[PDB]
Structure 1
Amino acid sequence: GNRRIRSVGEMAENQFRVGLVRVERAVKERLSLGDLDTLMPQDMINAKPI
């Protein structure tokens, strides 16, 4: 009752979220950088941390 199965979906989802925290941080940084008027969401998000 106190021990819990953490299977492949949950561990991979946690790792993916741990990655996603980095890329939202970078997006937040560059999005807080201004002149957003001509910008597209391929250079704010970077697939390398994910």
Structure 2
Amino acid sequence: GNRRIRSVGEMAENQFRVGLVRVERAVKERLSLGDLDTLMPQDMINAKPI
């Protein structure tokens, strides 16, 4: 009752979040200069970390 079991799904979601926080910091520092009418919501995101 005090020991919890985690499956592959929970670990995968955890690692997805670990990558997502890095991509979040990246998109936040990239949004510091992006203005209106200059970029589509595609270039600010990279595949690398996640």
Shorter-chain TM-score range: 0.7 to 0.9
* More off after superposition, 31-40 vs 18-27: 31-40
Give 5+ residue unaligned stretches, structure 1.
Answer: none
The runs of at least 4 aligned residues of structure 1 exceeding 3 Å deviation read: none
Q: Percent identity?
A: 100
Residues 4-44 of structure 1 show CA distances to partners (whole Å, capped at 9, x for unaligned) of 01101100000000000000110000101243431112110
| Structure 2 runs not aligned, ≥5 long | none
Q: CA RMSD in A?
A: 1.1
Give the count of matched residue pairs: 50
Q: TM-score, normalised by structure 1?
A: 0.87
